[PDB]
Every structure is written in structure tokens, then in C-alpha cells.
């Protein structure tokens, strides 16, 4: 879910006395009257507070994963509307690849933080396929038949025994 539009900008959230200003100033300094990048910054800060142990450290692998996850969500939201944007499709796919690489590094280095990142961001880590080969019509049909024939043989052997 997006932060409420009434939320203050990241840059005006700690200035002393921000609660004693007029409603007009509050609107002027909120997410309602800003571009989407400020909303993404607030999302990033929220995720950093929720997940990482030290939210001030932005150079850590977890922080980079959070930032790229927010960027990926932005790209997906863009592409729902812009179906023919090939450049942004490329950017989304490349960002997904980079996040998978960082997740692999995190899993190999810090499993607890890896689990926290996976739960907090709703990411499902998957292992890459072992072989990259075309699944053409002949192979697909043959594999389906082979699975069917194995099932039939299993049924026949169960009947026999």
C-alpha cells in the first residue's frame, strides 16, 4: 500500500514545530502535492525502518535490496499503464536480475538478514534453472507423453502388486 497523501515529505519530517503550522502549509509539504519520487522515498524509509537493523546505513546489501525493490515496484506500476514501453521493460527485467544477484549474495553471507528481507519485502527467492534450452513443440509433447506413460505404468504395477 502507498503512504497516505497527507504524509509529510521526508525532508520536512523532523524540522522542529512542523505540527504547529497551518493546514495549507501541511498540504504544501505533503505527498499530495509532490511527484512520485517523494512517495518512493517515503516507501524506502518505511521499509528500512521495518527491516534493517540500522536504518541509517544505506550502503549495506539489505539497504540496496530495499531500494532496488522500491525501484522495481515503480517500474511495474509504470508498465501496467505503458504496455509498449520496451525501454522500461528492459529496466524492470535488469533490476529484477540485479536484485536476484544481491539476494544470492545475502543468502550466502547473512541468512538471518536474508530471511528478514524476504519476509518484509514479500520476495520469494527461487533457484535458477540448471539448463537453458528451448522447449520446442516436439520436446514438450514427448515429455508430456513420457509423464503419462510413467503414470500408466505405475498404475499397472500397483494393480500387479
Amino acid at each position: 500500500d502507498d503512504p497516505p497523501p497527507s504524509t509529510l515529505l521526508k525532508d520536512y519530517q523532523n524540522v522542529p514545530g512542523i505540527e504547529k503550522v497551518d493546514d495549507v502549509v501541511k498540504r504544501l509539504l505533503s505527498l499530495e502535492m509532490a511527484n512520485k519520487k517523494e512517495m518512493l522515498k517515503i516507501k524506502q524509509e518505511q521499509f528500512m525502518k521495518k527491516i534493517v537493523a540500522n536504518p541509517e546505513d544505506t550502503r549495506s546489501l539489505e539497504a540496496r535490496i530495499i531500494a532496488l525493490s522500491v525501484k522495481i515496484r515503480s517500474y511495474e506500476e509504470h508498465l501496467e499503464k505503458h504496455r509498449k514501453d520496451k525501454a522500461h521493460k528492459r529496466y524492470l527485467l535488469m533490476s529484477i536480475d540485479q536484485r536476484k544477484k544481491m539476494l544470492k549474495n545475502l543468502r550466502n553471507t547473512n541468512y538471518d538478514v536474508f530471511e528478514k528481507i524476504c519476509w518484509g519485502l514479500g520476495i520469494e527467492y527461487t533457484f535458477p534453472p540448471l539448463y537453458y534450452r528451448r522447449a520446442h513443440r516436439r520436446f514438450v509433447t514427448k515429455k508430456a507423453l513420457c509423464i503419462r506413460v510413467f503414470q500408466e505404468t505405475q498404475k499397472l504395477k500397483k494393480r500387479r502388486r
Binding site: 525532508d11 520536512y12 523532523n14 524540522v15 522542529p16 514545530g17
Partner: protein, 51 residues
Amino acid sequence: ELMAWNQAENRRLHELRIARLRQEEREQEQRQALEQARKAEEVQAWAQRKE
């Protein structure tokens, strides 16, 4: 006997490592104090600008 000697060598290296790490900790404390002071100074002025 050779395994005992190897373990003794490991222990000696561990003591040397503890000494080196203690020195590193001290230097890191000094540098971190300086950087924290600089960070606080920067944040104060940036907050006053946004005020």
C-alpha cells in the same frame, strides 16, 4: 606432539590477533567520534535550512 605444537601456534597467533584488534578498536573509536561530530554538525545546519 606435532598436533600439540600446531595448537600452541594457533593460540599464540590468536593472542597477537587480540592485540591487533584492540588497537584497531581504539583507532576506530577515535575516527568514529570525529565522524559522528561532523555528521551532527551537518545535520544541524541542514535542518535549520529546511526550517
